[PDB]
Amino acid sequence: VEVLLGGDDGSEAFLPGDFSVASGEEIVFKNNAGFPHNVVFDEDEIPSGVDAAKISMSEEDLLNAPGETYKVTLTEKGTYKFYCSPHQGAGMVGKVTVN
Ligand SMILES: [Cu+2]
């Protein structure tokens, strides 16, 4: 699945923002507009025994040009909440359910 970081209008949302993937399916986050964006997984809201450091972007690495990607694959089944650091306050949060 591909997930846009920002709507074209600069809306601060993941698109889609609440989706499902199979274990092992690649998630392609694509910088869209309204950047800077990144993707961090909330360690309190992901399945037990998943290291959030392995699936989150590096803290200082922000996507700042259109089309730039961050690719990640989740395996442990469950729900995962993730967010954009800069726009967390503004409601740029998402949810993926791995099945
Ligand atoms: Cu953002």
Curated annotation (Swiss-Prot):
Source organism superkingdom: Eukaryota
Annotated keywords: Chloroplast, Copper, Electron transport, Membrane, Metal-binding, Plastid, Thylakoid, Transit peptide, Transport
Binding site for Cu cation: 37, 84, 87, 92
Cofactor field: Cu(2+)
Recorded topology in the membrane: Peripheral membrane protein
Domain named Plastocyanin-like: residues: 1-99
Tagged with keyword Metal-binding: yes
Cellular compartments annotated: Plastid, Chloroplast thylakoid membrane
Any one GO cellular component localisation term in the record: chloroplast thylakoid lumen
GO MF term set: copper ion binding; electron transporter, transferring electrons from cytochrome b6/f complex of photosystem II activity
Keyword hit for Acetylation: no
Physiological role: Participates in electron transfer between P700 and the cytochrome b6-f complex in photosystem I.
Family the entry assigns: Belongs to the plastocyanin family.
Protein name: Plastocyanin, chloroplastic
Encoding gene per record: PETE
